[PDB]
Amino acid sequence: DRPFKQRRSFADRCKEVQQIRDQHPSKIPVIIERYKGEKQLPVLDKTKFLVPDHVNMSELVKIIRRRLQLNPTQAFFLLVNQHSMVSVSTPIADIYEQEKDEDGFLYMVYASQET
Numbered sequence: 001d002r003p004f005k006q007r008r009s010f011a012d013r014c015k016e017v018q019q020i021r022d023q024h025p026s027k028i029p030v031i032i033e034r035y036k037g038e039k040q041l042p043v044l045d046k047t048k049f050l051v052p053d054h055v056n057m058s059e060l061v062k063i064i065r066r067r068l069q070l071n072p073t074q075a076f077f078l079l080v081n082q083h084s085m086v087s088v089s090t091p092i093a094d095i096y097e098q099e100k101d102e103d104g105f106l107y108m109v110y111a112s113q114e115t
């Protein structure tokens with residue numbers, strides 16, 4: 001239940017990304033985690049996702065909203081290195097090159113506020 005980086009060593013995280021490059025070359029390896037202090041939104045069922053590289057960040061927002069089963073009254077923000085993604089209709093492939101972690105994953109955090 002701890003964050004991903006506390007459950008896998010840096011070496012193991014790098015290895016995982018390299019494996020994903022071999023097995024699913026057209027996908028972006030993503031870690032999506034609930035903000036540390038979040039109180040309203042539920043937890044996702046899982047944290048690691050393989051995203052086809054053509055998916056827009058703004059579509060990813062709508063997909064995650066559906067996966068959390070949110071009403072249209074529930075606020076939801078998806079942040080990548082503190083940047084909100086709701087209006088970024090750019091493919092994740094381009095965000096990946098810019099925002100990837102040193103371990104090769106693309107990390108995101110979701111919250112009910114955009115701080």
Ligand SMILES: O=C(O)c1ccc(Oc2ccccc2)cc1
Pocket residue numbers: 032049050051052055063064067
């Ligand atoms: O358009 C697709 O086919 C596709 C496939 C996988 C995706 O990854 C997810 C799925 C749910 C939540 C977070 C990431 C997103 C889109």
